[PDB]
RNA sequence: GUCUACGGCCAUACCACCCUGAACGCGCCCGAUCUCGUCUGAUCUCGGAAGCUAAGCAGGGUCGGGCCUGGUUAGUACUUGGAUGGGAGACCGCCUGGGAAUACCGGGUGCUGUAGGCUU
RNA sequence: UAACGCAGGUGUCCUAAGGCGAGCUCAGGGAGGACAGAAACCUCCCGUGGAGCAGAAGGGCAAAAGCUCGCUUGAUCUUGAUUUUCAGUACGAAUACAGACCGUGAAAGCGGGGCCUCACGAUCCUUCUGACCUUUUGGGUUUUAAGCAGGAGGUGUCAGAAAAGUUACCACAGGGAUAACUGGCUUGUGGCGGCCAAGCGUUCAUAGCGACGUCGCUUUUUGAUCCUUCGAUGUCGGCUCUUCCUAUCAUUGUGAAGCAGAAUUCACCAAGCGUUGGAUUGUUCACCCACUAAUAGGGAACGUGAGCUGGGUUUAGACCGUCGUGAGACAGGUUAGUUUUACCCUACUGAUGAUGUGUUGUUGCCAUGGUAAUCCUGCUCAGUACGAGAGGAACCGCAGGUUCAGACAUUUGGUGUAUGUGCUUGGCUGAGGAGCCAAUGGGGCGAAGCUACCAUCUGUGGGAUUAUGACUGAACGCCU
RNA sequence: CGCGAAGGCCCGCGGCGGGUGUUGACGCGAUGUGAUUUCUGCCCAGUGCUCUGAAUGUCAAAGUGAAGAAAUUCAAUGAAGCGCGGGUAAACGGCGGGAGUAACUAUGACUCUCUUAAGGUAGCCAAAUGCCUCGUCAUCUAAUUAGUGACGCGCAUGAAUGGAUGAACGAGAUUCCCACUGUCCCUACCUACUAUCCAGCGAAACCACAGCCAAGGGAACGGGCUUGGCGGAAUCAGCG
RNA sequence: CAGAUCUUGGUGGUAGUAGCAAAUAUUCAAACGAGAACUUUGAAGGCCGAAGUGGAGAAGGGUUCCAUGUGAACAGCAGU
RNA sequence: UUAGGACCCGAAAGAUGGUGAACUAUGCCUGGGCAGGGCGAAGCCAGAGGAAACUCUGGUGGAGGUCCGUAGCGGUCCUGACGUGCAAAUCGGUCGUCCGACCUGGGUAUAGGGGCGAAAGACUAAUCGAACCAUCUAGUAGCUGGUUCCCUCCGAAGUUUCCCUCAGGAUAGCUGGCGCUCUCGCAGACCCGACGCACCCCCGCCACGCAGUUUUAUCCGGUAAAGCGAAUGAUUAGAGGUCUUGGGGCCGAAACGAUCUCAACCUAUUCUCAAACUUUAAAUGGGUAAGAAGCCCGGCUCGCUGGCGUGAGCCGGGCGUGGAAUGGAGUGCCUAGUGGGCCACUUUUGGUAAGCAGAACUGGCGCUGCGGGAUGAACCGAACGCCGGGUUAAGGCGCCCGAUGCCGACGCUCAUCAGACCCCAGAAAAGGUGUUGGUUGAUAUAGACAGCAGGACGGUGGCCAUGGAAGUCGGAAUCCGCUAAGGAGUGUGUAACAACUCACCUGCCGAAUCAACUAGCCCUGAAAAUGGAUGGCGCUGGAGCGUCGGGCCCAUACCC
């Protein structure tokens, strides 16, 4: 049956009675949507630092000690 | 019918001129906007009389027909028939709508 | 029809005026000051509202004004053409206008 | 001063004209065996160096059209916020602040990156 | 970011109008050429989109996204992510990617539909395609059926029911979110009044009107609206009765004329007082016959139904015409059709009584409220004023009337149950006489009483001023 | 219109069941119209009803063949009803529109024309049926939207869905005239039973609280609220 | 519990009010009796007026019939 | 949410099984009843007449869904009476039929989707367009009504999407409760911050974080405005220039040779516009960034990217908080009510307008009282525990009513309809030597405007129109002299008019005079229905209007 139509004017009070207007900006945003060809590689570069003990950081271990020895002479 | 000009006196709608989207508009009751001795050179008549509005209103093209005649009908009796020059500086463009609701 | 759908269909045509707009304008000799000033109030009665009447400072219908106008015509910057006067500026190749006519 | 090849900005680079040229540097150009496409070797493609700046192009000029940037127009129009402001009403003045556009009048007419020449 | 706002379009069309690459450049205009003309074909020039790209419109584009050629099917297979629809759910559509196999292009590139914005579809069910697929119930083979993934068959009410009417014989839940009456707000329309002044009024704008334009008022017209009532305000007219208004038909006082008199037209103070009898229709309205000083317009819940009438709308019965195949409908015609309650409060008209002067009684004053009188004819003035004439009044008197008001019964009429006196029908006391019964037996004549425009009498004086006409008299040496 | 009884119409939960039927076409059953008089026009296209049927178009249980290992798949064969073809309107029902044309002008015998299954024939009327409409003409009246009598271009009249008429009859619907009268002009008076008052006996509807007005605002018509006008106990008969 | 046109029970205002008006009509004296417009007797005046306000029946009622007595209650006042 | 009713009470209906024909409808069996008169059909007798057919006249006769009319049966009109009645349908008068299709008792038959119907959807125990009784049954209902003690704390929506959805639901949104992870003064007797504080200050420590704000930096748009000698569209008016043109033509080739003459064009100009036009283009507005999630170096990893570069990612090392102002933030569940809204400043669509319908932003009302607007949702002020004292906002301060009982300031206005305060309930175009200001042009000692001093003068009814016009419908025309002074003529009515009479100014008297525009108040314009409203009484050196001072009054607000 015949009746009245709407109106929309408390849309702003309810709006801000509560309601934080930020999406919680955050470090380590998820990798959802990146190029799969690009992403496959970055899954490999991780894979060959997470695999083994002798290959990678044996180069890291030596270079750090030089970083350890070089800086101390200044003090 | 009469449709007295009390109804369409204020300016309370967006301009709605005669165009392709508004067909069936009649022709305005004013057609001759200039009368007198039109060929007169600019050397001739150096006294330019004006009429200026004072209310942001609407003037019906019915009136401009009768205002032109009324002021013309006097000058002809005063100056002569080639002694003045009259120009209506207003054109009726904004067509106005009506509705029959009986 | 019961107002189940009421968009008007056109009739008549109207023109709008803003405060300061010039409705009607008359040219005449300088000796006919009074014939203009009261013929317009005779016209004023066929218009809604009230309109002021005054005599312009502008020579004829030209863009240019009271008695400095006769100098430029003598100075050769304006030329009379029918109901109006052309402004002769200097940006135009007047060395191809003076060469044409001093 | 400038040109050639590739460009960035994409008219202060345009358009109408007129004037002068800094090795054929760019072109005009002389031909059609071959490559190649046409009704036509005009175009496209291919082979050259007898001439030529007339044309393209570059530089300049027009109290030029345009174009860019200014000026007046104007603290005008318009407007955020206020009033127990005026007005029967159309509308308008004020306080608080923000603030334009034509007409018209001046100035300007390419800057430059990489690679490569010329001193005519 | 809304309305039954505005101007429009879609349910399709394409093996090319998709995908490339190349080469050209369009619309429009000018000047020239056998037939050839404005309008065929040939050439040159100007040509920033003025053309075209399927269609609606917007956007976009010139060595293209337009036109013409050459080759092709990226309109194919499979994963996910994101955007648009305000649930950040779907479908639809679209954007970047990724894995395959390809098309074109030497090439870099472009392409998984149309240059972008629309051209479309769930569960259940059926049908086709796919793998050495799974299951087919104690085991095995086969036919059959059931599954998994991907398309199609469609729900246009398009997030997707399977669906014809009438009810005036109607019913129930509710609704004043929702119509038919008043009552509101507005005033288009209806009615009324101004302003301007071209003219008409033989002369002249304004005696009387006033077009082209414009400004208002009223709610006695119909509209537009849905605010109140649908646990009911009885909804058309007429009869009866009161009051109120003025925008005045007649009456008292006056202004003006193209006003000689008579009749008249415009206007002012003005609502005291009047505004009728009838044929026809339900009528409001309308139109007529007649008289009259005139036969003016209206309001009070479109006054007034516990005041009436019920003629017409508008229940149920019927008949006709039209429509419907049919029940039935008509915003067409006709006929018959239950009108309920007052004793409550209030108001109103009457009637007792109340407080106070010590109690009673008599004779009176006015504070206030009501208000009442109105209209006409005849004689005379006078066939005069006025007018060539035709025609033709008034003031002061005299005599009477219509309307209304207050009474009265002498006369006239009516009443009559003094049941008064006679006449008289039927019956009844044995008859005469005297009487009775027949809801007052009938009918004559009738006292008192009550009554009638159907008889009779009476109905008034000042004050303040409005409209208008004036005196004196400045502002403004005159003039008012 | 059906029906000759192993029948028509019909009841029935069911039987060698029951009604018409203790009947038999001058009868039972189903309809429509409505005495008599006088007539009953054209249309079988539509919607129904009925009649027949070989060469049968569609056509379902059985039944027959063919292939398969079988469930099954396929084919031929194929009753009634439909489709095909006749009748029927006292079956439901229906029954035209344009131009031009006779010696003044109006009208139209006539001719041309498009279109249905026919094109409304006999009659009849602004009627109970005619929107325009208070049709036009006459009568009755002083005056008549009414009645009556003619006219017909009839939105939408019409033949048994009957047409037209007509003596008698009707608590049917309308108009007028004679007589009559209180219907009315214009009210009056008389009587009986009430009403009224007293003795006795005495209920029900109804009720937020209660009841004086004008204006304002308001849920846009107040008894209450605001501003005013004002207000006296208790009551009786009336009143709408 | 304040409500639901709430259920049951109870009581008001209205109200000593509406009302006890259909079919002609009653009066005088006496008796019992506490008491009399009404009961009973007598006198008079009236009506129903033989299709009756008369004399008997059928349906139906079921002791209302008849006598003696009562004055709570009912007989819309009263009552011997 | 399902149910046992399922908050409580509420339907119109549906199904199963049974009781009724004592009313009534109709058939049948068996009984009862129907005064008194009119009309006068067949049939029969007599008389007359005629050839016969048979015709007349007078009797007799007693037929009929016949007539007046009583019982009986029924129910027309008064739209009579009563209408809480005598009666849940009666009574009075008046009425129709009354030998037949008549009225009636008793006995028997037909029963609910059934009977019966001379047909009205009538009748079937006061009920019928499917009876009554019991049961399924406490039947369903987005639909009305009602829901029972106190205080404290918090506290909304009427909007999105979908729905056979429009009076209802689901879903977001808004609301409450319960917590939880951290900061934190729950910080000590040792002296903090190139980060925050309480306080030695935080060995443990989010001072990191965030906002209906502005500042700074950079983006974004296409409304108001503006523009059209800028594109599209619309549109007016002249100028100049020569091609097809005409219309009037001239020549007779032919005249855009020329020349008249208009014209479609072109050229520069000009008048006015646009929600679905736009070169320009604001105000307000929308994202971002304002440091440790950083600044910077050294090394390592690759199945992608290739000049030798790599882009992404991992390790390691030094510098920490980095524009203004405010206080704590983050996070998880369960969720009842709402999904009928309304009003105002502004912006705004349809409409003539509406106390109308439809939208954006904000604030209100609903949910909300209080002071003021006399009264009132929504206007102005302001937000509520119970109070005392003080002061305020909006309003006001004759009296009603707290406050001016100030010797308040300057002015304007006479209304026989004064005016008197946001929303608001107080009308206009047009007028007024009413009155008070302003603007503009004049004239005055080569002296004013009045009044006194003369007047519309005369050739002349000029010439004409004849239409009559010596001032007049109307005429090209329309002068002279006087120049105080008069228009070959301006308002009145007209036979042409007579006639009233519309101007300029001589001399004197002797300082202000004229005209037009213009705004303030007042007045006319201004008409309606009970008596009628600035709130009332009243108000006129104001208790009216404008521009303002001191002082004073009190709200639940502000202060103690």
UniProtKB/Swiss-Prot annotation, chain A:
Cystine crosslinks: none
Subunit structure: Component of the large ribosomal subunit.
Portion held of the full protein: 2 to 76 of 245
Compositionally biased spans, kind Basic residues: 1-25
Modified sites of kind Phosphoserine: 30
Residues bearing PTM N6-acetyllysine: 32
Name of the featured protein: Large ribosomal subunit protein eL29
Localization (cell): Cytoplasm
Family: Belongs to the eukaryotic ribosomal protein eL29 family.
Role summary: Component of the large ribosomal subunit. The ribosome is a large ribonucleoprotein complex responsible for the synthesis of proteins in the cell.
From Swiss-Prot, chain C:
Any GO molecular function: structural constituent of ribosome
Cross-link annotation Glycyl lysine isopeptide (Lys-Gly) (interchain with G-Cter in ubiquitin), location: 76
Keyword Ubl conjugation in record: yes
GO cellular component: cytosolic large ribosomal subunit
Keywords, in A-Z order: Citrullination, Cytoplasm, Developmental protein, Isopeptide bond, Ribonucleoprotein, Ribosomal protein, Ubl conjugation
Highest taxon above the source species: Eukaryota
PTM annotation, UniProt: Citrullinated by PADI4.
Compartments reported by the entry: Cytoplasm
Placement of covalent cross-link Glycyl lysine isopeptide (Lys-Gly) (interchain with G-Cter in SUMO2): 63
GO biological process, one term: regulation of translation
Keyword Hydrolase: no
Cited function: Component of the large ribosomal subunit. Plays a role in the formation of actively translating ribosomes. May play a role in the embryonic brain development.
Family: Belongs to the universal ribosomal protein uL16 family.
Subunit structure: Component of the large ribosomal subunit. Mature ribosomes consist of a small (40S) and a large (60S) subunit. The 40S subunit contains about 33 different proteins and 1 molecule of RNA (18S). The 60S subunit contains about 49 different proteins and 3 molecules of RNA (28S, 5.8S and 5S).
Protein name, entry field: Large ribosomal subunit protein uL16
Biological source species: Oryctolagus cuniculus (Rabbit)
Stretch of the intact protein here: 113 to 214 of 214
């Amino acid at each position: 049956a015949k009746s009245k139509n709407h109106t929309t004017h408390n849309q702003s009070r309810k709006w801000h009675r509560n309601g934080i207007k930020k999406p919680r900006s955050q470090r380590y945003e998820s990798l959802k949507g990146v190029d799969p060809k690009f992403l496959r590689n970055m899954r490999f570069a991780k894979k060959h630092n997470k695999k083994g003990l002798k290959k990678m950081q044996a180069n890291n271990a030596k270079a750090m000690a030089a970083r350890a020895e070089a800086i101390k002479a200044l003090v | 019918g009469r449709r007295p000009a009390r109804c369409y006196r204020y300016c309370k709608n967006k301009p709605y001129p005669k165009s392709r989207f508004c067909r069936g508009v009649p022709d305005a009751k004013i057609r001759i906007f200039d009368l007198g001795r039109k060929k007169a050179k600019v050397d001739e008549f150096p006294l330019c009389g004006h009429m200026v509005s004072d209310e942001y209103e609407q003037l019906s093209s019915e009136a401009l027909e009768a205002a032109r005649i009324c002021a013309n009908k006097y000058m002809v009796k005063s100056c002569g028939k080639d002694g003045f020059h009259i120009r209506v500086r207003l054109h009726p463009f904004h067509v106005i709508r009506i509705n029959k609701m009986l | 029809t019961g107002m189940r759908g009421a968009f008007g269909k056109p009739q008549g045509t109207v023109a709008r005026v803003h405060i300061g707009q010039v409705i009607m304008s008359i040219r005449t000799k300088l000796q006919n000051k009074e014939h203009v000033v009261e013929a317009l109030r005779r016209a004023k009665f066929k218009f809604p509202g009230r309109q002021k009447i005054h005599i312009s400072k502008k020579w004829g219908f030209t863009k240019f004004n009271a008695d400095e106008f006769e100098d430029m015509v003598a100075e050769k910057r304006l030329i009379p053409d029918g109901c109006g006067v052309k402004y002769i500026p200097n940006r135009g190749p007047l060395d191809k206008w003076r060469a044409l006519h001093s």
